[PDB]
Design a protein around this ligand. Sequence first.
Ligand code: XAV
Ligand code: XAV
Ligand code: XAV
Ligand code: XAV
Ligand code: XAV
Ligand code: XAV
Ligand code: ZN
Ligand code: ZN
Ligand code: ZN
Ligand code: ZN
Ligand code: ZN
Ligand code: ZN
Lengths: 284, 284, 284, 284, 284, 284
Amino acid sequence: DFSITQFVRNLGLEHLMDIFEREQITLDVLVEMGHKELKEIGINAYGHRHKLIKGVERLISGQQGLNPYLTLNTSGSGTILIDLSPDDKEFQSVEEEMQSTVREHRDGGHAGGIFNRYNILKIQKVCNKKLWERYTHRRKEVSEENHNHANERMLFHGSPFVNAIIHKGFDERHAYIGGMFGAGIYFAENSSKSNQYVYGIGGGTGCPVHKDRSCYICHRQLLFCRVTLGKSFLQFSAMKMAHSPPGHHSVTGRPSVNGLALAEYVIYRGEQAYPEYLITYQIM
Amino acid sequence: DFSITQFVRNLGLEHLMDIFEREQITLDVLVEMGHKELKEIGINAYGHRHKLIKGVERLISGQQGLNPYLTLNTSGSGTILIDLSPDDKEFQSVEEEMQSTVREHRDGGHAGGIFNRYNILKIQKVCNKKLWERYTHRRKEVSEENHNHANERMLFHGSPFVNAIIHKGFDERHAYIGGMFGAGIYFAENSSKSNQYVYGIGGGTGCPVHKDRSCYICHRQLLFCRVTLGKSFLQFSAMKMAHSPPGHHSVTGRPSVNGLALAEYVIYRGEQAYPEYLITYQIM
Amino acid sequence: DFSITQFVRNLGLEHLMDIFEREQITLDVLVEMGHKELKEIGINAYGHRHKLIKGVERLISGQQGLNPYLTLNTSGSGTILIDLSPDDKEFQSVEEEMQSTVREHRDGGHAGGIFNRYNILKIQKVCNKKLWERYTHRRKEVSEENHNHANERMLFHGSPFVNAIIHKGFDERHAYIGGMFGAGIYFAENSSKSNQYVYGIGGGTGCPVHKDRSCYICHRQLLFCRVTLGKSFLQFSAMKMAHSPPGHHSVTGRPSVNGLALAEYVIYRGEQAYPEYLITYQIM
Amino acid sequence: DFSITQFVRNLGLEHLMDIFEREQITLDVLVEMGHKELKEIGINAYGHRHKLIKGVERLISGQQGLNPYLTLNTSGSGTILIDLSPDDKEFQSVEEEMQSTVREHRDGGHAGGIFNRYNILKIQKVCNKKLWERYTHRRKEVSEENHNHANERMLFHGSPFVNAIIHKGFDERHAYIGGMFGAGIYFAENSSKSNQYVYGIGGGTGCPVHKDRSCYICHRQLLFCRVTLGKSFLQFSAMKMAHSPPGHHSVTGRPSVNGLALAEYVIYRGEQAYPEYLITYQIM
Amino acid sequence: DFSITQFVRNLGLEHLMDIFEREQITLDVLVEMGHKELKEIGINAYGHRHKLIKGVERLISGQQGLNPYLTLNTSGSGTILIDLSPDDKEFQSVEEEMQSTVREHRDGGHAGGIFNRYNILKIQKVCNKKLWERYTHRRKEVSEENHNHANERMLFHGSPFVNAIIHKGFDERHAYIGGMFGAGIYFAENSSKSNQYVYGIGGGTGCPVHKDRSCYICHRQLLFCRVTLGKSFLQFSAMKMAHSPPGHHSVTGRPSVNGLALAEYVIYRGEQAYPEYLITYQIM
Amino acid sequence: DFSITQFVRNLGLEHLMDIFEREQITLDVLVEMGHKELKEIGINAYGHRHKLIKGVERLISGQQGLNPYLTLNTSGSGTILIDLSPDDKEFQSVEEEMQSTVREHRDGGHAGGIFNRYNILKIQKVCNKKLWERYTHRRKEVSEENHNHANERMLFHGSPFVNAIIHKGFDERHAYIGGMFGAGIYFAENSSKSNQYVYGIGGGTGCPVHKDRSCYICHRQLLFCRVTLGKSFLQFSAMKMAHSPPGHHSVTGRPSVNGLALAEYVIYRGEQAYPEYLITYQIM
Ligand SMILES: Oc1nc(-c2ccc(C(F)(F)F)cc2)nc2c1CSCC2
Ligand SMILES: Oc1nc(-c2ccc(C(F)(F)F)cc2)nc2c1CSCC2
Ligand SMILES: Oc1nc(-c2ccc(C(F)(F)F)cc2)nc2c1CSCC2
Ligand SMILES: Oc1nc(-c2ccc(C(F)(F)F)cc2)nc2c1CSCC2
Ligand SMILES: Oc1nc(-c2ccc(C(F)(F)F)cc2)nc2c1CSCC2
Ligand SMILES: Oc1nc(-c2ccc(C(F)(F)F)cc2)nc2c1CSCC2
Ligand SMILES: [Zn+2]
Ligand SMILES: [Zn+2]
Ligand SMILES: [Zn+2]
Ligand SMILES: [Zn+2]
Ligand SMILES: [Zn+2]
Ligand SMILES: [Zn+2]
C-alpha cells in the first residue's frame, strides 16, 4: 500500500491518505476512478479530484512505454472453474457428447482401459480472460481469411498436463512431436481416443496410485475444447510437418481402411484452441 | 461454493470469504450485486466493492462468448403449478368452457368413453419463464406479419405426454404425423375431442390401471392452451403437409358434412402454443 | 406526409412547421430526436422541445400496443448487395472453395451439364438486417441447446428462386418435399451438386433462353450460406421426415457405398440458414 | 457501383443520387461521412442526413457478424515501396551495415560468389499497414512475456521469394526445413551469409539468365528486417525442432570452433518479423 | 493560496473567491480549466468565465519567456515505485534473468561475495515522467540515425548510488573514470558482474553494517535498465576514451582469451539509459 | 518516382495520374495536401479527395512505427549560407568583433601568424533547420536547469574541419583531447586565439599551398558561434575531464598569473553550440 502513498505525496495531497486508508483504495483502484467515484468516497473539493485525475493521466498515458498499467492490472487474472449443475441441459449435452462417441479401439483397452461407459463426477466451465481474448483474436484472424468462416469445432483432448493447459493455455511449444502428422496439438472427435492419452503416450504406466491403465478407481480428466480449424488440409496417410501446409490453418486426418480408424484434428498454433470444459470421470 | 472462493482468491480478497460464508453468497448471487447490496452485507471499504464489481464485469462481459451468465443462471428456472381456488371466477370460467363444449362423437364413446359431463378435481396455472418468453417472441413475430394481429385463441389438447409438454413445452419434433393435415400439433375447441386422445391415438389401451378406455375411476388430464394462429389457412379435406402453407401460420379445419364433425386447429411450430391450464378431471 | 403536421398541430406548435419543412423532418425522423438534435435544427425554446419530446413519448410508448414505431420504421429495411473486389482475399477464398469442390457426378452431366471449372463473374455479399437478426436469434437458441456450440458451416444452395430467398430469407414453407430426407431445406458442400439445381429439380429444362441444361452462355447464381447445424443426426439411408428428430437440430447424410455419392445437409427451420454470398458464374 | 444506389433507394432518397454521382461517393466513402461531410457535399436537409447516417449505422454495427465493413474497406491496402535518397543518412547507414558485415566464407564463394563489397543500386522502405499491425501486435505480446522487452534486432534475409514476402509477409508455413535448427525462418547478421541464399539453397543454379552463382551483372535482392527475438535460446550445435523451446521465442546459434562460423537467428512464427528495407545490389 | 487571489483580484472578480476557496482551486488548477470545468464549479455567468480564461491565456502564452507554466507544474513530478507481484509473469521473468546470468568470477568472490543464487526480496518498477521523456527523446534521435533501429537492450547496473539514479537518472557527469573503456556508464548482461559493484569499486569495503563484502544478511539493490546502444563499436582491448568513437553511440567489450571474461557495455550519455527495474535481494 | 504511382494505384485512382504527372505531385508533396489543395489542382469529386486523404492518413499515422514521414521529408534539409551585406550593421558588428578582440600572443605568431588586423572577405549566416532545432532543444533543457537562464554567449572557434561542422554540427566525438580541460570543444572570446587553430593544433604546418603558418595570401575561415554555457565551472589551472563537472554545464578558464593568457570556454556536448557566422578572411 506504498505506491499509492508515494503517488499522493508527490501530488501534495497527503492529508487525504486517511480517506484512502479507510476505503482500501490502492493505486490500481485509483487509476480507474473519475470525478464521480472520487466524490463518492468524500473527495469533495474539485481541485483535489482534478489533481488526482491529472496525476493518473500522467502516469498511465504519459509513461505508456513503461506499461505501468499492465503492472497494475495483475489482480483478478487467472482461471476460475464454474461447476455445471447436473440437472441443467448444458451438463447433459456435454455428458451425451462424452458417452455417445465411445468406440472399441484396435487395442483391447491397453492404452485407455476396458470399458463401455463413463461415470461422470463433475463438469466445469473454464474461464480465463486473457486466454479467451488470445483465442478470439486468433479466431478473427482466421475467419478474416477463409471467407468469414472460422470453421470452429468442439473436440476432445486428453493429456497428463491438463492443469498446465487450463492455467496457461494450449502451446505448440509443448507439441506432440511423435504424432502422425508431427509436431502438433491433437484433438479427437471421439472421447475414448482422447482417453487413451490421459496418462501419457500409449497410456503411460496407468494411474499414479496403482500403475493400472484400466484403473476403475482413480479420477481421470479430459478437456472439451473450442478449436479453430479454418481452412483444413485433408490427409489420409502419415505426413510429418512442423506447421500447417501453405494456405491452410490446420490438418484433418480422415479414417481409412489401411490408415486411421477414427478422425483426428491437428493445429500447429496454441492460440487456435481454448479449453472450454474440464470433465472429471471414471471408466466403468 | 468453490467458484466464489476461486473468484475471491484471484481478486486477492480472501479475507472476506467468512462474510461470504455467513450470507451464503454464491457466484450466481455475487454477479447480481452492486455497491448498495455489497454495502448491506458488510463490505464497507469502497476499494473492495470496486474490485468485486470490476471482477464481475470482466467475467460476465469480458468472456461473453463463453456465456458464463447462462451457466450461473440455471437455478430458479423450471415449471411450477399454481392451484386455482374453486371459488374463483377464473376456475368457474375454465370449468364452464370444459363442460359446455362436450359433444357426442360418431363413435359410441369408444375413444374417450361414454359420458355427458366431467367431474373437475383441480385446475392448475402453469408458470415457466423460459417457455413463456419463447412463446411471446413467436407471437410478436407473427403479429408483425398479419397486420399487428396475433389471432390468439384458447384451445384444448390431450396427450399421454402432458408432463413433458408442461416441463419442456410443445415440440413440433413430436408432432402427430398421422393426423389428417399431417405432422403438426392438433388442438380442438371441444374438450371431449381432446379427451379422446388423453391415453393415445384412438384412446390407446385406456387407463393404465384397468386398461379401460371408458374408466370412471382413474384421473385424466387435459391442457387448455394459448395458441397463436396468425393468418390461418382454411381447409375442409385431408391434406398431408409438413409445414404451414406459404403465407400462413396455421391450419383451421372446419366442420363438413363429408369431412370434419368438429373444428380442428393445427400448428407447425412448437413455440406457437403455450400450455396455460392443466385440468384434472374424471368422466361421468 | 401529413403525420408530422397533425402531430405538431395537436400540440399547438403549428408555427414551427416551416422549420420542419426546410429540414425535411418527417414523423419517423422526429421520433428519434432528443434535445440536442432539436437544438441543432433551431428549436431554441426549451418549452417547445419539451412538448415535442413528451408527445413523441406518449405516441411511441403510451400506445405501444398499436406498435406505431414499427409503422414508422419501415424505411431502410431490405436487402443490399455489396460487390466483392476480385483482388481481395475474401473473393479469392470464396472462388477457391467454389472451384476446388467440383466433382464428377454419377449422371453424365445431365442435370448440371459437362464442366470441370467455373468462370466466376461476380461475388456479392447479401446484407439484410432483419433476416440477419432472425438468423442470429435462432443461432443463439440452438447453441444454448448444444453446449454453447452452434456447429456453423458454410454450404452451397441452388434454387430457381434465389431472388425470393435473398429478399425474404430461407423458408421451410417452400421446402423440397421430394428430397431424400423429407420436407426441408437442402445444402451441399460440393458446388457442382448445388449447381445441378439452379434451374430446378434434376436441372429442369435448362436455361430460360436456350432451354439447355449445359449452356455455357447464360449466367448462373449460387448461394454460399451460413447454416447452423447444431446437434446433427447422422444418416446413411433415405428416410422422410417433416421435422428434425427429437433432440436434434438438423440431418446430415454422409456418403455411403450403396447410398449417397456426396454429403448432404438438411435443416427444417428457415431461420437456421442465412445466404451470405451470391455468386454469378458460368460453367466452362 | 450499384451498392450506393440500392442503399439510397432503400432509404427513399433516390432524388439525392445525382449529387452522389457528381461527387463520386461510393458506399465505402459514405460509411465514413457524418453531418459535416454530408453538409459539405450539399445535403442541406437535416432529415436526409439523419436518414443516411442511421442507415449506415444499421449496416455497419447492426450486421457486424457479416463484417460488411471489412468488405467495403479493402481498397487502399497493399504494399508500397518508398525509395530512399542516396544522399540521406538512412540510406548511408543501411549501406554501411551491408558493406561492413561482409566476411570470407568457408567455401570459396561457391554459394554466393567471389567479392569483397557490393554495388548498391536501390534501397526501398516497405510499407504495408496490415503486415505492420500483425508484427506490432505480436511484438506487444512477446515483450509482455519478456519483462517489457521485445529484444528487437535488424537482420538480413536472403530468399528467392522476396516478392512474396514483401507482399504477404513472413510465413512459417514456408520455413527452411533443411536448416540446422529445424523448420524455422532464418536470419543472419552478415549480409554475405544471406547473399548465399538469394538464388536458392546453396545459391541454387545461380542467376536465371547466365545460371551463374557468381554473376557480376544481374541484380540481387536482400531484405533488412526487424526481428523480434524475445527470450532467445542459445545453441552452439545443430538440433532440429519444429517450434521454439519452452519459455522461449527464438533460437540463436552462436559461432563455435567445431560449429557455426557465423551467428544465426531462427524464429518459428512468421509474424515475428517485418521486412523493412528492400536492398537491390550487385556483387563486385 | 495567494497567487490565485491576486489573479482573481486583478480581474476584478474577488466576489468569486469563496467558490475558489471551497473547491480548493489554485492557479495551477485554474490554468487548465475551460468553460465546462468553470461551469461545473458554479461560475454560471459567461462573462466571468470569459474573463478568467482570457486572463489565463494572457499569463501562459503572453509571457511564455518567463515560463510561468513550468513554475506552476512542479507538483506531481518525481519518482514512484510500483511493486511487482511475485505471482506475476513479469516478476518471474526478471528473477529468472537475475538467477540465470550468474557466473563464477575470476576472483573467488572477493568483490561480490561467494554464492550461486540470490534470494529475491522484491522487484519494483520505477516511474518518472520527466526522466522517461528524456530517455525516449534520446532514443528517437539515435534511431533516426542507425536506420530506424534503437538497438535497445536490458542490462544490469550495480552502484552505491542507485537512489540518486532512480530519482535523477543516469548521469555521465558521474561516469566511472577508471573503467576499462574510460569515463562511461557501464552495464553488464551478467547479474553477478554488476553485483560486484553494489558496495563500490572492487566491492568497496562491504556492507556498511558488517563491512563484509560477502555478507549474507544485508539487502543489496541492482538496476535492470533499458539501454539504447545504437551503432555499437566492437572492442576487445582496453581503450580509454571520453566519448563514443566517431559515428557510434556506445562501446561493446566482447570476451577474449587474453581480455574480458564477460561482456560489457558502455554509454557516454546519461540520457541513453533508463532505470526500469529496482531489484532488492540477498546473496545466498 | 514510382511511389506516388503505387500509392494512387492501390486506391483505384490511376485515372488521376495524368493530373499528378502534370502538376509534379510526388508522394512527399501529396502527404501535405488536404481538400483545398487537391481542389486547387483539379480533383473535383469529393469522393476522390476523401480517398486520397484517408490513404495518406493510413500511411503516415497508421504506420508511424516505420517512420515513413521521415523517409519522405528528407528533401529540403541541408545547410544554406546567406551572405551579409558589407553595408549592413550586422556585418559591421561581426567585423568589429573580429577586429577588436585581436591580441598579441605569448608565442611570436608561430601558430597563427604575425598581424594586427584582418581583411574580411565574407560573412555568411549558416542556416540548417535540424542543427538549429537540436540547439534550441538543448538550450531549453539547460535553461530549465539554470533558473530559466541559458547563459548564451557568442564565441569564436577555429578548426581545420569547419566545413564538416557547418554541415553536421558540433560533435564531442571529435573533441580536442589534448586541450587544457580534457576532451571538450573549445571556444575563445578573442578572435586571434581561435585563429591559432585554423590549420590544426599549433597551426599545423600552415596553409595547404605554401605550407606557411603566416600566409597572407590564403583564405582562412573562423566560426562565430552561439554557445549555451548554463552553469559554468570556473577553473584557473589545467585539469583534464571527460564531461562537465557534476551539477554544471560547461567549463570556463579565466586568465591567471601562471595559467591562461586569455579566457577559454569548453563544452562537453556538441548540441550546446550552433555555428552562426562563417567568416572568410586573411591576415595582414
Ligand atoms: O487427446 C489426445 N492427446 C494426445 C496427446 C496429448 C499429450 C501428449 C504428450 F504426452 F503430452 F506429449 C501426447 C499425445 N494425442 C492425441 C489425442 C487425441 S487425437 C490422437 C492423438
Ligand atoms: O388433442 C388432440 N390430441 C391429439 C393427439 C395427441 C397425441 C398424439 C400422440 F399419440 F402423442 F402422437 C396424437 C394425437 N390429436 C388431436 C387432438 C384434438 S384435435 C384432433 C386430433
Ligand atoms: O442446392 C440444392 N438445392 C436443392 C433444391 C432446391 C430447390 C428445389 C425446388 F425447386 F425449390 F423445389 C429443389 C431442390 N436440392 C438439393 C441441393 C443440394 S443438396 C441435394 C439437394
Ligand atoms: O538469409 C537466409 N536465408 C535462408 C533461406 C531463405 C530461403 C530458403 C528457401 F529457399 F526458401 F527455402 C532457405 C533458406 N537461410 C539462411 C539465411 C541466413 S542465416 C543461414 C540460413
Ligand atoms: O554495473 C556496473 N557498475 C559499475 C560501476 C558503478 C558505479 C561506480 C562508481 F563507484 F560509482 F563510480 C563504478 C562502477 N561498473 C561496472 C558495472 C558492470 S560492467 C563492469 C563495470
Ligand atoms: O578555437 C579553438 N579551436 C581549438 C581546436 C579546434 C580543433 C582542433 C582539432 F583539430 F580538432 F584537433 C583542436 C583545437 N582549440 C581551441 C580554440 C580556442 S580556445 C583554445 C583552444
Ligand atoms: Zn488407480
Ligand atoms: Zn381406470
Ligand atoms: Zn442458355
Ligand atoms: Zn547473371
Ligand atoms: Zn551485512
Ligand atoms: Zn598560403
